Amino acid sequence: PSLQIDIPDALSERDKVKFTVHTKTTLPTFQSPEFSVTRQHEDFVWLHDTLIETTDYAGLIIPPAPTKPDFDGPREKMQKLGEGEGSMTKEEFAKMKQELEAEYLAVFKKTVSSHEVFLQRLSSHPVLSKDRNFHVFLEYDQSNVSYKYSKVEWLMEEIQLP
Secondary structure, three states: OOEEEEEEEEEEEOOEEEEEEEEEEOOOOOOOOEEEEEEEHHHHHHHHHHHHOOHHHOOOOOOOOOOOOOOHHHHHHHHHHHHHHHOOOOHHHHHHHHHHHHHHHHHHHHHHHHHHHHHHHHHHOOOHHHOHHHHHHHHOOOOOEEEEEEEOOEEEEEEEOO
16 A cells, blocks of 8 residues: 555557556655656656666566557558548448457557556565655656747747646
8 A cells, every 4th residue: 555556547649658657655755645647658668677777676576568559550440441431331330440449449458557567566566666766757747848839929838747
């Protein structure tokens, strides 16, 4: 109960998957006992690389890194189906669309679980759960600074999304 992590939601975009990493904790070192941050697969790879290279963890079993999210099969089949929009019986597209969405969903389930299990294994570990880089991964809120540039005369707006 000292450190509970889950991934309540994820966003699949064209070239990206974003995970919401949600932490409940009683550790006094954190700013808040419960918080959420947005992380991408590469942030998980950075964390795993960092653990792997820490001299003090030599001989400890470090949980495997999560597998890269691959939505290519579903998206390619989505693109192909849009072509037969004029080539089927008003049901067949519908049935084709449902199968495509099941395939998306099956990918989502697998990739969220892989990324989630990785964090949960770290949280279970008597030594690794104390790792400072692991703590930064969970609570640092400046990882996704985005700027909007708009022409009304041009104005640039900072957009802050933890």
